[PDB]
Design a binder for these strands. Structure first.
Ligand SMILES: [Mg+2]
Length: 759
RNA sequence: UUACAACCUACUACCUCG
DNA sequence: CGAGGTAGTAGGTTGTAA
């Protein structure tokens, strides 16, 4: 876009500050000196050295060497001092966090405002609070390459908090049983979470899944400020008015979170922070400047709009579209000419009592909903170019009220049905809502997923509330169910475009899952790996991981890359002088040492005959940056609407430069924004590891964008590139399956090698 | 567990450097 | 093993399907 406005302001800083520097090779002394010199000096440890900035005349003295520190060369000093000085600039706002300074609005409280707007009241409602929370993050950025500056970035959220005495909630007739409670006050490094409520007898809450002690005094504990606890309290207290409160609260928040309202709030924060000089030290001021923009003015080259992603439906490119569903329904799937299994046999496993409902869903899915539900008129068979689909019906004698034996019944019925039947190529498993979230030792989702994956049969499962959706929602659910089921059968629904530049490119991602059976039990880490290859004008999904242990994960990345390089070379028969590029994706940066051994081992495997280029990229969701497109009017929220959605939301594929290694990428355009009250979106942050030998982060941001469009879980694009997302879905599944009796990964790389079984 | 999206809370980690 | 900058991951509730 021409000009993208950020949520940050320039901070005009002195061009240098004098400081006193002392060697301190042991960081553990810092906390003793910081305290010792409180109020008189700001101190900061960097690079084995203690840096001391005099904030005011007279107090303990410091020894060391005098140095002048030039802000252009070492912005880290004054960046850290700003964290404290912003706090000091706002003495009437109490820090609820430091670094970044985070604080509450003085008066605004939205429960009260929503209650008033809805016409509601209840004696305990003043004890439920939703309060705007602002943070001010000083960040280093580079308008133009080689030149640094510090800006202050403004972000807004809401603190949800339930102040109510547990005694008063019990006495007003809310059932506290099972609610998570936290300490009212926390000490330094003390935990918040205490456990769940078993009972309140006497002056004390009895807890289970406790973290430390098994009981705690009513007055030391509060319900955690979760949506679960708000809904459970307020629905009980307000009954059939609860809906009115909710819709009105949604309106209040929109007043802080939509584009023009966010923009206006950042404006007002800036004007407040600007009104005075912000003082860094006794005789040293900083000054909050203009809003930071991302533009191509005056030899800055800080923004671009990537072209639209093309959804690709053949090996050439004749058949492309801007949207997955419109492409698919028009051309059929990318692999239609070669797809091997025109007559899939699909086992359908379901509670016997849901038979008529399951038959209706199956008819809709297979044969279509017809021409009044135009999102899913024609059905899976014609959609995908198949000859037919045979269902093998597997009813299970199981009740929704059965909490302990549901998994056993599903599995027995599967075994018994399969033993007679011939080959089945996939299954659909239909699940009761009350079974969906049972613990894994008795969960029918995971037990049936396990048994059928062991047998080499991918499944697409579904809950009964989904089976029963009204037809206008059901059409969109059948789109997504269809896309994943076809992919489960080895199909390639679509690919995404790329330009033929170098002689081969491999992208590998890694994803984490952190699993436990409850919130009070320590999570265990598992990983997945997903690979994607450049093909002939479009990107192709490779093989995925079958092992999921987190320990050794850098070696597993290295092993995946070196094995695939070796096989890519044999296949493509690279010529002397060809260039091969390897890109890695994750939600965190790799270690420098691991980058070194990966590069070493990939370079040794490829050999001296080819050039290799390697990039290591972090994709970040939660950071302090927001992009505002003031040109964007937004769209009508539905047909004929004075309300707008995605007002000020940058276009999808907008790429802004933060610094040499970092870009912001806008993914959620007005079209994709859900409703009028949906907030201004945040972009993803794309960061290139400094040790990368391939350096074009613009190219890597556009590539990440394309990979969000490659998901076969949905017609709509994913939140993060499939290299990472598929890996998280694999890690979660494989880490759960680890503990399920009789699970074996043996078929994962045999019957299921081309099955997208993890979608 | 059709999904996409938003939010909230809780939990802690990750990388760097010495 | 700690300073320092940073933000990841899980699970719940509600609205909507480029
Ligand atoms: Mg799925």
């Amino acid at each position: 876009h021409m000009q993208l406005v950020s949520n940050g302001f320039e901070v005009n800083l002195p061009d240098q500050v004098e400081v006193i520097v002392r060697d301190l090779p042991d960081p553990s002394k810092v906390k003793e000196e910081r305290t010792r010199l409180m109020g008189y000096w700001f101190v900061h440890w960097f690079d084995g050295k203690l840096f001391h900035l005099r904030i005011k005349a007279g107090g303990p003295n410091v020894d060391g060497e005098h140095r002048a520190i030039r802000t252009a060369e070492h912005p880290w000093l004054l960046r850290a001092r700003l964290d404290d000085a912003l706090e000091e600039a706002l003495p009437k706002y109490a820090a609820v966090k430091k670094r970044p300074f985070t604080f509450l609005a003085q008066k605004d409280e939205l429960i009260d405002a929503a209650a008033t707007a809805a016409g509601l009241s209840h004696r305990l409602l003043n004890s439920f609070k939703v309060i705007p929370r602002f943070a001010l993050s000083p960040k280093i950025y580079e308008p133009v390459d080689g030149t640094t500056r510090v800006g202050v970035f403004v972000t807004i959220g809401m603190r949800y908090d339930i102040e109510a005495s547990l005694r008063d909630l019990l006495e007003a007739g809310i059932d506290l049983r099972g609610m998570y409670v936290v300490r009212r006050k926390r000490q330094p490094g003390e935990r918040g979470l205490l456990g769940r409520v078993r009972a309140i007898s006497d002056d004390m809450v009895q807890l289970f899944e406790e973290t430390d002690l098994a009981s705690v005094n009513v007055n030391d504990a509060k319900l955690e400020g979760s949506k679960e606890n708000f809904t459970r309290c307020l629905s009980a207290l307000l009954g059939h008015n609860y809906k009115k409160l909710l819709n009105a609260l949604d309106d209040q928040e929109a007043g802080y979170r939509t584009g023009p309202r966010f923009d206006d709030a950042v404006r007002r924060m800036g004007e407040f922070l600007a009104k005075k000089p912000i003082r860094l030290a006794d005789n040293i001021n900083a000054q909050v400047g203009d809003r930071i923009v991302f533009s191509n003015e005056g030899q800055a080259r800080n923004v671009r709009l990537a072209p639209k992603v093309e959804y690709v439906f053949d090996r050439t490119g004749a058949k492309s579209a801007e949207y997955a569903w419109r492409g698919l329904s028009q051309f059929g799937p990318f692999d239609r000419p070669s797809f091997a299994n025109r007559s899939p046999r699909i086992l359908v496993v379901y509670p016997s009592s849901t038979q008529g409902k399951v038959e209706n869903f199956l008819s809709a899915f297979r044969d279509g909903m017809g021409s009044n539900y135009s999102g899913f008129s024609k059905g899976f068979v014609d959609l995908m170019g198949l000859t037919k689909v045979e269902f093998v019906m597997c009813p299970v004698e199981v009740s929704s009220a059965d909490r302990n034996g549901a998994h056993t019944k599903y599995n027995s019925a599967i075994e018994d049905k399969l033993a007679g039947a011939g080959e089945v190529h996939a299954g659909i498993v239909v699940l009761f809502e009350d079974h969906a979230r049972l613990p894994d030792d008795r969960n029918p989702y995971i037990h049936t997923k396990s048994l059928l994956l062991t047998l080499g049969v991918p499944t697409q499962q579904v809950r009964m509330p989904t089976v029963l959706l009204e037809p206008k929602s059901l059409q969109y659910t059948l789109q997504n169910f269809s896309i994943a089921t076809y992919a489960k059968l080895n199909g390639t629904p679509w690919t995404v475009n790329h330009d033929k530049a170098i002689n081969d490119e491999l992208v590998v991602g890694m994803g984490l899952a952190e699993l436990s059976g409850s919130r009070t039990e320590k999570r265990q880490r598992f990983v997945g790996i997903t690979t994607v290859f450049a093909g002939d004008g479009s990107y192709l999904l490779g093989n995925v991981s079958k092992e999921c242990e987190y320990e050794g994960y850098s070696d597993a990345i290295r092993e995946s890359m070196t094995g695939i390089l070796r096989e890519l070379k044999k296949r493509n028969n690279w010529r002397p002088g060809d260039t091969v590029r390897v890109v890695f994706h994750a939600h965190r940066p790799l270690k420098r040492v691991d980058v070194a051994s990966i590069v070493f081992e990939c370079t040794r495997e490829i050999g001296s005959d080819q050039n290799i280029q390697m990039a290591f990229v972090t994709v970040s969701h939660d950071h302090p940056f927001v992009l505002i497109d003031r040109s964007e009017r937004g769209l009508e929220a539905y047909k004929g609407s004075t309300a707008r959605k995605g007002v000020f939301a940058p276009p999808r594929g907008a790429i802004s430069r933060v610094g040499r290694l970092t870009r912001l990428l806008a993914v959620n355009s007005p079209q994709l924004i859900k409703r009028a009250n949906t907030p201004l979106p945040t972009p993803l942050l794309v960061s290139l590891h400094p040790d990368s030998t391939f350096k074009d982060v613009d190219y890597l941001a556009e590539q990440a964008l394309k990979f969000t469009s490659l998901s076969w879980r949905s017609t709509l694009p994913a939140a993060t590139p499939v290299t990472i997302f598929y890996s998280e879905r694999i890690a979660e599944l494989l880490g759960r399956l680890k503990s399920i009796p009789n699970w074996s990964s043996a078929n994962l790389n045999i019957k299921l090698k081309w099955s997208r079984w993890f979608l």
